[PDB]
Design a protein around this ligand. Sequence first.
Ligand code: ZN
Lengths: 754, 576, 223, 235, 77
Amino acid sequence: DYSGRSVIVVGPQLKLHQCGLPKLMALELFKPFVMKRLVDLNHAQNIKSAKRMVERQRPQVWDVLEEVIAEHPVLLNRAPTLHRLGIQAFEPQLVEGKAIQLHPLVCEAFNADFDGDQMAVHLPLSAEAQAEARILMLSSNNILSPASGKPLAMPRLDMVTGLYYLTTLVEGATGEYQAATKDAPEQGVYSSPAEAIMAMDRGALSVRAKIKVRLTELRPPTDLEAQLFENGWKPGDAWTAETTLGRVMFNELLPKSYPFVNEQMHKKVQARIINDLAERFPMIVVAQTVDKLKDAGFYWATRSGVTVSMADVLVPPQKQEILERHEAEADAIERKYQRGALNHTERNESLVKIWQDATEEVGKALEEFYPADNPIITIVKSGATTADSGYLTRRLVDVSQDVIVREHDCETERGINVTLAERGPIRDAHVETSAFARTLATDAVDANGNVIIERGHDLGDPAIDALLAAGITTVKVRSVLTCTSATGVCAMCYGRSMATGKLVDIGEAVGIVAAQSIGEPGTQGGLPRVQELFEARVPRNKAPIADVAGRVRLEESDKFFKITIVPDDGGEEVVYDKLSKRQRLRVIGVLSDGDHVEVGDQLMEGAADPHEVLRVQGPREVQIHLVKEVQEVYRAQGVSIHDKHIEVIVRQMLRRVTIIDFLPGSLTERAEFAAGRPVLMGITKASLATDSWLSAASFQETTRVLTDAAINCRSDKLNGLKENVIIGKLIPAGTGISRYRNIQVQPTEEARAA
Amino acid sequence: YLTADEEDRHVRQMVSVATAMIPFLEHDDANRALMGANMQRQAVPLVRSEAPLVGTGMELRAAIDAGDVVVADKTGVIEEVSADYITVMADDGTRQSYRLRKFARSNHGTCANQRPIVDAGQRVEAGQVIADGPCTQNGEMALGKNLLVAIMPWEGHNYEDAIILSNRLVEEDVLTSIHIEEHEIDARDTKLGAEEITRDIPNVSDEVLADLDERGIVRIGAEVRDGDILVGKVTPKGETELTPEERLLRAIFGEKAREVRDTSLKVPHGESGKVIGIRVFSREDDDELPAGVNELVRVYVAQKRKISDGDKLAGRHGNKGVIGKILPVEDMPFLPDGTPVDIILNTHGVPRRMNIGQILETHLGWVAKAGWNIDVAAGVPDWASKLPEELYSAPADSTVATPVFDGAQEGELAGLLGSTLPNRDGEVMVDADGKSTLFDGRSGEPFPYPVTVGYMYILKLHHLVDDKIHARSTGPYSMITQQPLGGKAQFGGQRFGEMECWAMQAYGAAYTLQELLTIKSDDTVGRVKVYEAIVKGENIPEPGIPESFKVLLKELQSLCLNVEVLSSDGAAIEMR
Amino acid sequence: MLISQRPTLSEETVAENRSRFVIEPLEPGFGYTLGNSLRRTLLSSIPGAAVTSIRIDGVLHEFTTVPGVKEDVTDIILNLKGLVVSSDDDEPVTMYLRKQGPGVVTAGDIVPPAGVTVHNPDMHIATLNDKGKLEVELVVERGRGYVPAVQNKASGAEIGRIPVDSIYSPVLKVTYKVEATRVEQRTDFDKLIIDVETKNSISPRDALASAGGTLVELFGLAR
Amino acid sequence: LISQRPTLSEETVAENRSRFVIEPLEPGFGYTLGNSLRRTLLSSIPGAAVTSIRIDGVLHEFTTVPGVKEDVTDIILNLKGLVVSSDDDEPVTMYLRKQGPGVVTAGDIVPPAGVTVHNPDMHIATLNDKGKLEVELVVERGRGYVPAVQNKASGAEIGRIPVDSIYSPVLKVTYKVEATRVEQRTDFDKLIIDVETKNSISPRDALASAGGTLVELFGLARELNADSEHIEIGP
Amino acid sequence: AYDTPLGITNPPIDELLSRASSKYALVIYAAKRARQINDYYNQLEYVGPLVEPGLQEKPLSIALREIHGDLLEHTEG
Ligand SMILES: [Zn+2]
């Protein structure tokens, strides 16, 4: 109940925390509410009169609607719902028309195109529900992707081009600064930022000019800030620098405390600057700062002067004619191939040189052919421009939903090593998804020298650069794989919440968030390989791993390969019998005969059997391997998923050890546990093995689970959150934990006196 | 014709009917073409049905073949023409007539009005068009209107797919379309008695009946809002066993508790319009109505639908978006004429999304609207070498046809923009680039850069905001499962799926989730308690047990599974 | 450097319905802002002079036909919308139009009551034939801007009457242009001309003077 | 015509800054008069400012002054902040001379009869140990913002520096528009105007100045007929 | 300097999160106080509003201002 939907239209004039609500919809939605207020203020005496008064849409009820709506949040949601950001809270504003007005920045999260999409609206009723919308699900509090930590409400597609244009620098623009000499003084300087505006309204100053002025309210750059003061600041102080008037107006949008930027506001830059703000400033600041970038971005997107027409879209006539010689030479070489002058490989290689010649020719024209100030290029230079995967996400969710932070610290010293941008004379490209937002298991000291960072630090981006100076090439960081928490995981092991940017809060259901963070791009060497890994199935094409360390002897049979490892023991030689030449050797360079090999190296390029490396290298390594494989697939498609998400899923695969024999049956929990062995099993098998029998029934193999559960006469403790959802109980996560649902709210004796 | 197998023996046809009507089809991507064709068969008939200004040769043959247009069977001359019928006196001496469909409802509620295009004393020929169909003008398909377009991003109101229109399109009824809805209700024999429809209703004021006739059906030409009565029907009821508090008022006010219950047709929630016609079928006289039915009456309601913010528009090239805003004609980017532009389309869709043709019919649209006269006296420019004669000169507002795979070529288009005759007082509004200096109608200052302007042919799409907006606070509840459902008088409830539950769990909002799944959907006792709580202003009550779960236990028990609730203290509980 | 010479407003004529107006002298960057400040007011708040509702004896609603006529009632309403009227009497008043026999009904066939006048009698309304009898009344009211058809359920008109969209805007098409002269030696100034065109219900001077009165009274920042 | 309800309210941000709000208008009247107000306040209010100066010792030296840290440019825009109201309405010449080390302010300059400097504490330049300064100033009444004129382009006055003239007292102005419920429709204009002013005149008085020069400006058009019944706007 | 928040956003969550352990505690924190305030407006005596209320302020928005002012203390179970 208390729900509705309609088609959505753009809301460029809205604040980030707001939404346009059709009056009629808001009327029927709040019907019961406006009925009480309509009777209290004695417009109608009995409730029956109030109902007919709203039903007939009497003109008097529109004033009572703004009063009940005020500061009463609503929940918007668009199907399909991929991540938790697919549902957010907004401040409802009554609007004319039958369409919902959605803030333009939230389109990224909802993946909401304005081609006619519809959005649903729900009305939180109780106090706890309203509070959850105001605090937990509010729009302006959720800015960062809960998968990569990257900002999502960052401007896009319109404001990008607009901001790009505003800050760009044009040579010889009207009013360009000139250091006049010997006849008059310099003409490019200006008294204050306001004066330049008066010179811009008049034909004197072009916003994209290279003029220089003295600012008294913006903060100067870091390097230039030391030379000028080094002791005081410029809240009332002044200083001069040479920048475009636009770059000035741009920096005005940022916070006063942030240092001057002075750059062409490239697409990539705005990500940097917005990222920095989230770390240094509270949420409300970033929310308001992104709101200001929207207005400016749009305004200048209109004055940008970007329109398509005959000239811009025109494809160069010369390109078509140049390819004629290009196609005749590629064909003329084909006529020589048949004659016998081909030489059989250079001819094929030479054709690529012909074909490559056209590619070079189009580049020879491309930027010279279309004037540098081309609107199609400007859009490019600025950077502005199903269920099968959701089937996998369902198994992901069902195997990790009960994974929630249950304590602040487990106090374990165990951890895992991060490469941390090694191979320098050079930062690793994947540090942002492996080292960022972690916590140190052991202190990090550079010898010889002082300890660079103390154990248990947040390992923010500023810390990496500080670490980079020391020349460090590895780091030990806590992880949910090594966490020793009896129930769930601990905050310190999990680390920083991607959404909040601070330490994860106890009660966060990191399991579900992990499954979503992984599932969303699933719809976006693909899903079969990912599903092959999480289900723990033997690789499609098996690849052998080294069973022992030593040198290697390589032999080539007919259509086969033989690989013998000469151990350094040196004991029984390890021989890997028959290996299809179709599945060629791995790479170090490419492996050759006589190279040294370690206890776990993959001998040939391919998918190693996870059950193989488990028996060989032990549980801790299988997790490292699987995460490396999964993250490599997503990395191949350009998807940024922090390792901790994948790790949450992997942790649930090694939780049980086979016994089957000192005990009745196998597959008892590691904590539950007379010798057992570590086990690797797929998510589907792992989730069906949960202790709750109605959770396993609602998931898969319904008939099977009941029969075995009825015989064993099992009893469900109703501990997991799935169960409580079915019977209507409070899920044991978030606001449902014991610690959080027993808070006693009493006013201090000191406050009541007032 | 060539046989399929005959293709091996010896060595525009690939285009469909909907596809062959997209001008500049060759330059648009194949995928965009099909998408554009689907949207042509998605348009709705407009009251005025203006023909496309830049089209292709197919419109004429396509219109008459559809069959919704009136074609003279034999050459002759008309005798009398009235909105009802047209009759032509053939030279042969025979006499033929044609009754014109007027405001007939289509399958999906679209209007099927025909218009007469001929006059008295007019000669006609065999196969010639006599009257215009719904979406035709003078014999060719008119699925939309021609509008002035500016391709500037206008301050985020046209953000990323949305569109902004002039208020003119509302004042001038250019995009206005009529829609007709049918309603039905019947009187039959019942188990208890016989259904009877009449003006008398058990409990009503004389104002709701103020629009009903004797029989109790709404009178023709009446205006009906949501919840009003269309047909007054009543069915037997008993035993009543009315509550004591109900009867005490019955005696106090002296209103006898009637023996029958009200089953009367009311207009659905969110619908409104005038009553066009009524179709009454009664068993009394004639009328083969199925066994049990004693009378039937159908009500036809129709409405003029002004183009509204939220509706969907689209061109023939696959571009579609919602009407994001409608700006007053005043504060609209307008040419130096003071000529406001109709709609403002954003440029962002274009980058590497090819849709190139959409820009071509925009320039050709301005050429066709303004007229041209090539400069061929001594020049005879090289670009017009391939051109046909006397196309050189054309007057203002002329129509143009560019068949798909051989239409106007690129070079010729450029030359046509060079010859672009003035507007009333000699002056040029569009350069050879198809751009012009537009004046921001809200600030007054011109837009610093030349903006592309032209005339494009766009369509009003099938699904409209009025039909798509839904809202519900409380309404009907399903029988087997108490979850809400919207039947008559829509009041349908939005459905909160598992994926939505996943997100709700991810946030940690335990209460919001419980509320949605228990007291908003399935709690037979909770939903009523929260409604009582809201009206009193008291705190929201504590949720109970979702009826879905209760039914679950019975389903397990029906399967011979002894489910036991197993409380910590009493150890055995019956839901009751 | 005060160059003080109060602005001068000059009438002019290009046609009967429209006529230019030229105001000089003015400061820099003042023409564009002032011009659109009047255009936005002209196109909107000039009072009419419009028709609210109509009533045809033979018809009860807009979606029927009249025996004999060529246009349906919905196509006649669309025609009736284009008519430009003018009324100097407050308090709605009704016109009449009765035509019989073959011929063509036009705006001239409409009999205006005392105090109103039809300014484009040449307009085509409907074409009648031998059997066609068109008896129609029209209610003229005075307002401004564009008002949607006031439905007869909001006002108790009754079944019979037909509400129609009303357009009170005597102004047809407005534009402007400025010829600011930047003088290097001395005396920078601006000068604009506006092009006001009306619907024949009032004159360009009448409209501009009405728009001027609105803005003048509206700029009450003195309080 | 009778408009339902206009109003105008004022809230002060600082001593020389204030927000003005008009509520409610009739759509789309916000954009109509909005841009015309900012245009009037900025370029239509009479005020006096500096046109051109000349310094002793700076005749063909491009950028340096002896015995003072500040250079040519830094002092030109230092003076552009000088606010002085005058009724002479012609290029009067004030004079500033201070000897010895020390910081000169806008109070050291001797104002001729009719000119009154409003920012005495304004910093102008810092002096070297054992230094003296003598600068000539040309002040004339102004309107808006006139860029620095070319000195003569004629025979000449050797060693004459024209400077950008900030004639109007209003430093800068910007406007916004919002919609508020009229109890019937959501779309009713709300005009927000943001004016930062010189201490010559306050914002309240600065707005009325723009209101008078604008209402009398439109009086011409009203004079043509004066009986077309435009809009009442109540009392 | 984070300019004045509008309606729902005020008060900022950061300044609220200093008054409790987590964002989830803040929820229950203000929620139970909201039920407390609304009971006082009808009728185990009821307390509040400790802060001078607004024109028509909702009890949940009152409890958030109260928490921002440290006017009450809570204990987690
Ligand atoms: Zn841990």
